[PDB]
Write an enzyme that holds these catalytic residues in place. Structure first.
Site, short mmCIF file in Angstrom:
data_model
loop_
_atom_site.label_atom_id
_atom_site.label_comp_id
_atom_site.label_asym_id
_atom_site.label_seq_id
_atom_site.Cartn_x
_atom_site.Cartn_y
_atom_site.Cartn_z
N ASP A 133 26.72 2.27 79.40
CA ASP A 133 25.66 3.26 79.41
C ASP A 133 24.54 2.76 78.50
OD1 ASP A 133 24.09 5.52 80.07
OD2 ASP A 133 25.62 6.98 79.37
N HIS A 156 22.10 5.73 82.06
CA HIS A 156 21.96 6.86 82.99
C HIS A 156 20.48 7.34 83.13
CE1 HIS A 156 22.80 9.43 79.53
NE2 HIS A 156 21.94 10.22 80.18
N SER A 181 19.63 12.37 75.77
CA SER A 181 20.14 11.10 76.34
C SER A 181 19.47 9.87 75.72
CB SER A 181 19.91 10.99 77.82
OG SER A 181 20.66 11.99 78.52
N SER A 222 25.32 8.96 75.07
CA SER A 222 25.69 8.89 76.46
C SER A 222 25.92 10.30 77.00
CB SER A 222 26.95 8.07 76.71
OG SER A 222 27.26 8.16 78.13
N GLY A 250 18.24 16.12 77.15
CA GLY A 250 16.97 15.71 76.58
C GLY A 250 17.23 14.67 75.52
#
Lengths: 185, 51
Positions: free
Chosen positions: A63, A33, A141, A156, A139
């Site tokens: 992801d 993502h 991720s 994810s 932040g």
């Protein structure tokens, strides 16, 4: 630069998952993502320290994404923070895991379930996800999910927060390793 | 930002901040929209960026 550290695209900030490589070619893994629609990655908000460029992106459904390093000098630690990573393994229910993110730092918990499906809406559905009781916030991720020296997953998403507590899902790292032919160090 | 499709059961934590009427910086639109729902519609957008 290591796992858990910030990474910046033209659009916002994520977390470096793990430093990996193939032969003499180094890359980094993060969330799909984050890699979707991003070309260049920088090591800082000022966008001066260039890290590299997107080589691959798998989101939604999975992801994970990969970034070929173009910065020759930046040190590419095969760790998560100070923490060394030697291998990778598959999550197991009841496994004690640790996550590190660029906003939140280090938070611990355990794997509550496997193969969860998470719908982020508008057809962004992901599957085959590790479920945990670990919190994570914007932040975070793409941060690493480890268990001692083992690489387990990539942040994810999920719900809740680190103050009130929450649920976070991680994408198994082995799937990403295998898709691109890379290995942890 | 339109928060019609909310609430949403999960959010990816990518950081793209917004400033709410409550002077709290929300990490991204998804976190922002679920809070607006949580407040029963009470919360608004002050501006994009950190507060």
């Amino acid at each position: 630069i290591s796992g858990g550290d910030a990474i910046y695209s033209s659009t916002g900030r994520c977390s470096l998952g793990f430093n990996v490589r193939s032969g003499s070619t180094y890359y980094f893994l993060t969330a799909g993502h984050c890699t979707d629609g991003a070309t260049t990655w920088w090591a800082n908000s000022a966008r001066t320290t260039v890290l590299g460029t997107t080589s691959g992106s798998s989101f939604p459904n999975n992801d994970y994404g990969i970034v070929r390093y173009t910065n020759t000098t930046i040190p590419k630690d095969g760790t998560v923070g100070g923490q060394d990573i030697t291998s990778a393994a598959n999550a197991t229910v009841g496994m004690a895991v640790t996550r590190r993110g660029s906003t939140t730092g280090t938070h611990s918990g355990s794997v509550t379930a496997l193969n969860a499906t998470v719908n982020y809406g508008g057809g962004d559905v992901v599957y085959g996800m590790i479920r945990t009781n670990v919190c994570a916030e914007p932040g975070d991720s793409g941060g690493p999910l480890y268990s001692g020296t083992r690489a387990i997953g990539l942040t994810s998403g999920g719900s809740g927060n680190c103050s009130s507590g929450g649920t976070t899902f991680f994408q198994p790292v082995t799937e990403a390793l295998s898709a691109y032919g890379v290995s942890v160090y | 930002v339109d928060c019609s499709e909310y609430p949403k059961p999960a959010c990816t934590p990518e950081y793209r901040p917004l400033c709410g009427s409550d002077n709290k910086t929300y990490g991204n639109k998804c976190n922002f929209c679920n809070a607006v729902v949580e407040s029963n519609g009470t919360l608004t957008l002050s501006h994009f960026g950190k507060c």
